Amino acid sequence: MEVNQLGLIATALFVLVPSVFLIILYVQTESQQ
Amino acid sequence: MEVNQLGLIATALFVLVPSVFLIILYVQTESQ
Amino acid sequence: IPEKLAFYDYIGNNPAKGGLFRTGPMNKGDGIAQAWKGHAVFRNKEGEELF
Amino acid sequence: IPEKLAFYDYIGNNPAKGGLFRTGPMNKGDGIAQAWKGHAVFRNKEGEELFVRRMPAFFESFPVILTDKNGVVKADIPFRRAESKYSFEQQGVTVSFYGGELNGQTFTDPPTVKSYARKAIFGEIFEFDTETLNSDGIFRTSPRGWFTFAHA
Amino acid sequence: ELVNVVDEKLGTAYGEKIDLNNTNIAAFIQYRGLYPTLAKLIVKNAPYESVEDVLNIPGLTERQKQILRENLEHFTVTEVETALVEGGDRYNNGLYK
Amino acid sequence: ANLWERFCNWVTSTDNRLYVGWFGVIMIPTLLAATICFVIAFIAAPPVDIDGIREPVSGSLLYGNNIITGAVVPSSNAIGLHFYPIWEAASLDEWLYNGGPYQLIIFHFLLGASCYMGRQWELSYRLGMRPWICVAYSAPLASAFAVFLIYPIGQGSFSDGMPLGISGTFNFMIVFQAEHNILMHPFHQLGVAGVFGGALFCAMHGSLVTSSLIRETTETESANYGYKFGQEEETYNIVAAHGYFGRLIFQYASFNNSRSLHFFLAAWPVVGVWFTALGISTMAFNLNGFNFNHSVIDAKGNVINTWADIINRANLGMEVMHERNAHNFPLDLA
Amino acid sequence: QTLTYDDIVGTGLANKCPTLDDTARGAYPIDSSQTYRIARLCLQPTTFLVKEEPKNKRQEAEFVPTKLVTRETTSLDQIQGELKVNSDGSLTFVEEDGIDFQPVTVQMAGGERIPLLFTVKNLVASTQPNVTSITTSTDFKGEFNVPSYRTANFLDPKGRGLASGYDSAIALPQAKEEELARANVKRFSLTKGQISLNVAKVDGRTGEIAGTFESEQLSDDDMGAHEPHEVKIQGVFYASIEPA
Amino acid sequence: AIFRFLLFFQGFHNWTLNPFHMMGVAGVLGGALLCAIHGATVENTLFQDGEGASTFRAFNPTQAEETYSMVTANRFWSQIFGIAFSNKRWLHFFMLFVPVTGLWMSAIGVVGLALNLRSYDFISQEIRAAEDPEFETFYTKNLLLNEGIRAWMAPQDQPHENFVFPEEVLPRGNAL
Amino acid sequence: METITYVFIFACIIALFFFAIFFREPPRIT
Amino acid sequence: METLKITVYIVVTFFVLLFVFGFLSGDPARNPKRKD
Amino acid sequence: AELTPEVLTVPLNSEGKTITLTEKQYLEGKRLFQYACASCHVGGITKTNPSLDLRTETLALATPPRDNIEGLVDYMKNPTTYDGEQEIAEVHPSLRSADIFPKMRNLTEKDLVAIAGHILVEPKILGDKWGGGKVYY
Amino acid sequence: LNPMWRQGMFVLPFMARLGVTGSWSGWSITGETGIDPGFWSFEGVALAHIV
Ligand code: CLA
Ligand code: CLA
Ligand code: CLA
Ligand code: CLA
Ligand SMILES: CC(C)=CCC/C(C)=C/CC/C(C)=C/CC/C(C)=C/CC/C(C)=C/CC/C(C)=C/CC/C(C)=C/CC/C(C)=C/CC/C(C)=C/CC1=CC(=O)C(C)=C(C)C1=O
Ligand SMILES: CC(C)=CCC/C(C)=C/CC/C(C)=C/CC/C(C)=C/CC/C(C)=C/CC/C(C)=C/CC/C(C)=C/CC/C(C)=C/CC/C(C)=C/CC1=CC(=O)C(C)=C(C)C1=O
Ligand SMILES: CCCCCCCCCCCCCCCCCC(=O)OC[C@H](CO[C@@H]1O[C@H](CO)[C@H](O)[C@H](O)[C@H]1O)OC(=O)CCCCCCCCCCCCCCCCC
Ligand SMILES: CCCCCCCCCCCCCCCC(=O)OC[C@H](COP(=O)(O)OC[C@@H](O)CO)OC(=O)CCCCCCCCCCCCCCC
Ligand code: HEC
Ligand code: OEY
Ligand SMILES: [Cl-]
Ligand SMILES: [Cl-]
Ligand SMILES: [Fe+2]
Question: Most buried of F315, H58, H131, K54, CB within 10 angstroms?
Answer without folding.
Answer: F315
